[PDB]
Curated annotation (Swiss-Prot):
Enterobactin binds at residues 102, 130. Induction: Expression is activated by the oncoprotein BCR-ABL; BCR-ABL misregulates expression via the JAK/STAT pathway and binding of STAT5A to the promoter. Induced by insulin. Changing residue 121 to A: Strongly reduced affinity for catecholate-type ferric siderophores. This is Neutrophil gelatinase-associated lipocalin.
Length: 174
């Protein structure tokens, strides 16, 4: 493995006055960028969806659903409130083999249409980061997609590390 290095956290803005209640519900992954994300023209990445449910204790149950091998695949994360509102750590990190580190920062959102979220983790001592462009719908404007490309490039990622998953109906319409 050779990886583009994680950016310093100083280059990753935090959404001011983060509203945890308004960030809840279903988000479509309209854009994906990161040091382990590679464009694949033979088999282009399919859109998946992530559901944020705020618990009584103010941590998030995070359920993601993707269409793989004719079936809906579910995976669950717990996001624990971090240092400042809009940051999170991963609950029960010991239950993920090789994972020593996991950070979430909500970069920007208007809550009812779009969000950009930064993830950083250390797995088998390798440092991974990604940015997801979230949509409340499966389509976003040229403007929001160019904003996400610009932001991804500001963190050192070239074009072939930025993908726009293809909209689908299976699994993610529930």
């Amino acid at each position: 493995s050779d990886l583009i290095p994680a950016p310093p956290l100083s280059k990753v803005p935090l959404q001011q006055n983060f509203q945890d209640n308004q960030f809840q519900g279903k988000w479509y992954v309209v854009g994906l960028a990161g040091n382990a994300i590679l464009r694949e023209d033979k088999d282009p990445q399919k859109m998946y969806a992530t559901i944020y449910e705020l618990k009584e204790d103010k941590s998030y149950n995070v359920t993601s659903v993707l269409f793989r091998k004719k079936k809906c695949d579910y995976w669950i994360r717990t996001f624990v409130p971090g240092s400042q509102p809009g940051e999170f750590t991963l609950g029960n990190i010991k239950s993920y083999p090789g994972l020593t580190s996991y950070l979430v920062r909500v970069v920007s959102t208007n809550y009812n249409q779009h969000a950009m979220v930064f993830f950083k983790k250390v797995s088998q001592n390798r440092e991974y980061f990604k940015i997801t462009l979230y949509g409340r719908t499966k389509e976003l404007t040229s403007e929001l997609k160019e904003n996400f490309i610009r932001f991804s490039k500001s963190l050192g990622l070239p074009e072939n590390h930025i993908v726009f998953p293809v909209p689908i109906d299976q699994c993610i319409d529930g």
